[PDB]
Specification:
The complex is a heteroheptamer, with one copy of chain A, five copies of chain B and one copy of chain C. By secondary structure, chain A is an alpha/beta fold. Chain A contains ten helices and 15 strands. Chain A folds into two domains: about 1-170, no CATH class; about 170-284, no CATH class. In chain A, strand 14 and strand 15 form a beta hairpin. The longest helix of chain A is centred in the middle third of the chain and has 19 residues, at about 150-170. By secondary structure, chain B is of the alpha+beta class. Chain B has one domain (about 1-65). Helix content of chain B is about 15%, strand content about 45%. In chain B, the strands form two sheets. Chain B has a three-stranded antiparallel sheet with strand order 1-5-6, with no helix packed on it. Chain B has a three-stranded antiparallel sheet with strand order 2-3-4, with helices on one face. In chain C, about 0% of the residues lie in helices and about 0% in strands. Classes of the chains: A alpha/beta, B alpha+beta, C little secondary structure. The PDB classes it as toxin.
Chain lengths: ~280, ~70, ~5, ~70, ~70, ~70, ~70
């Protein structure tokens, strides 16, 4: 399955993301308005991927058009990137189970964790700037890349492209904040600590939201939603937790309802595991 | 004896550093400090508690069950 | 496992 | 007396190791260390707390507090 | 020995300040004060624990427990 | 004075019995054990903390901190 | 040395009252009493912990640990 993400305008970009979501996921019964929902990725066999062709970096122009991302379908991870001009798939070391026919697969030494990518890139995501201009720069870096080990510029390019494709697919919040950079003003998107925290809590969020039944709030670690509009404004696609390993940290209880708020059980457990404070502090 | 069984209707930290819970319409207190977080957690997560005591006043034995 | 991109 | 009843608006650890909570627009402090994490749990979870004391002036001390759920 | 592995079916604070958990159908008590809130939090989230003891009969004591992510 | 306000980015216990938190790009430390569970719970629940001190030198100690849900 | 940086695969309360975590395939123990709830909270929320110690072989002790969200 192949989809285009077209960066020409905010319209073309959001349309692209919405079409992907519609094809690969199904709305939650209880978090859906119109055709805008939190949706659960439909089950695919392990190893299944879809391709994303990057378009519209130069508005409405058929240039800068040789970059494709390979996305593992069940978890939306970028498995690597394809230079369609050289017919080469540069694949991260944690995706040797992703096989793409027809391309030359270059198996990289670099893994795709944000820890690794930020290190190699010498670029932290908190505060990282993304503009149309730096997406073009990212595209050029990825097209110039060769070899089995990511360089700094290739890693920076992957950080930016993953944010505006896969992470925006997951989070309507990131879609909404980044898309302003596509406008004629050409402003800069700066990814916030809150954006980063969302991405880091995706698995936990995915385990909790299927249990939502209209509670006044949702609390998942550092993440809080106070109403359905906050949920819908923030989250668009979650893992299928029925199942995926990212759904579970420990224990087997997704949620606890406390005072009309749906808590991730592990969050409550993590502040209800303290003994008597006087005994704690004096028992050194 | 099982003095009371049910959800904690309220808890209360007392000026004498004891701790009171209301369960199934009756109030009981304990002087054991480590029961303070244990009981408040039970109250927050909806645990069924069983207050137990030779006389059913104070207590220092309580069973905790998830809902 | 730390978060993968 | 019941000095204040409501959700904890903020809590604050103080340099003298006392602990302040703001409830229904009034601030109260306790020197009972055991209350620090319990009040934090109450604040995190939106319990309704009732501050009890023989002095109910904002800024006064307390060592009795009831915790209620919705 | 590894006596019981599974979720905590109930927990109980005891008159002598020890603390009992029922795991895999058998009851075990511990006098380790620090285990009391840890075990209760494991209980509330369904965390699998492994009780380790010299004797594994229901009613045995333990001073060692592993908290697993199963 | 208000030294830093924000969510806790990370916390760290050091061999020298100090507990560091990073808030709004600045690091502060406390040796009050009372504050360790309070600060870590604030970190894991996304509370906004306000570090308060007489002088707000970077890397300075603190023993006053406000906790807010938002 | 930076010995390990990863999620807590399990924790264990030991018979000598120290507390062990398994991180990145190696086991590390600490006698620091303050760390026991903090480490369990880390395990419960999938925090990344950084274990630092003078020796990093499995079975080494530690007193310094950083708690990260990311």
């Amino acid at each position: 399955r192949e989809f285009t993400i077209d960066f020409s305008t905010q319209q073309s970009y959001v349309s692209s993301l919405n079409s992907i979501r519609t094809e690969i996921s199904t709305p939650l019964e209880h978090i859906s308005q119109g055709t805008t929902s939190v949706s659960v990725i439909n089950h695919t066999p392990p190893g299944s991927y879809f391709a994303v062709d990057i378009r519209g970096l130069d508005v409405y122009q058929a240039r800068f058009d040789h970059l494709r991302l390979i996305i593992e379908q069940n978890n939306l991870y970028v498995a690597g990137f394809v230079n369609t001009a050289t017919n080469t798939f540069y694949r991260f070391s944690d995706f040797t189970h992703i096989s793409v026919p027809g391309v030359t697969t270059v198996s990289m030494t670099t893994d795709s964790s944000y820890t690794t990518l930020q290190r190699v890139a010498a670029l932290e995501r908190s505060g990282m700037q993304i503009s149309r201009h730096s997406l073009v720069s990212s595209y050029l870096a990825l097209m110039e890349f060769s070899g089995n080990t990511m360089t700094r510029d290739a890693s920076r390019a992957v950080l930016r492209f993953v944010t505006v494709t896969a992470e925006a697919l997951r989070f309507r919040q990131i879609q909404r904040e980044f898309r302003q950079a596509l406008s004629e003003t050409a402003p800069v998107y700066t990814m916030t600590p809150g954006d980063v925290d969302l991405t880091l809590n995706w698995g936990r969020i995915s385990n909790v939201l299927p249990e939502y039944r209209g509670e006044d709030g949702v609390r998942v670690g550092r993440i809080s939603f106070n109403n359905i509009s906050a949920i819908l404004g923030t989250v668009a696609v979650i893992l299928n937790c029925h199942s995926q390993p990212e759904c579970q940290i420990t224990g087997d209880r997704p949620v606890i309802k406390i005072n009309n708020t749906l808590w991730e059980s592990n969050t409550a457990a993590a502040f209800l595991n303290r003994k008597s404070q006087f005994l704690y502090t004096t028992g050194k | 004896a099982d003095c009371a069984k049910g959800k904690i209707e309220f808890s209360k930290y007392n000026e004498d550093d004891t701790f009171t819970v209301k369960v199934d319409g009756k109030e009981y207190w304990t002087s054991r400090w480590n029961l303070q977080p244990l009981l408040q957690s039970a109250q927050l997560t909806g645990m069924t508690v069983t207050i137990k005591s030779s006389t059913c006043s104070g207590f220092a034995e309580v069973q905790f069950n998830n809902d | 496992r730390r978060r993968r991109a």
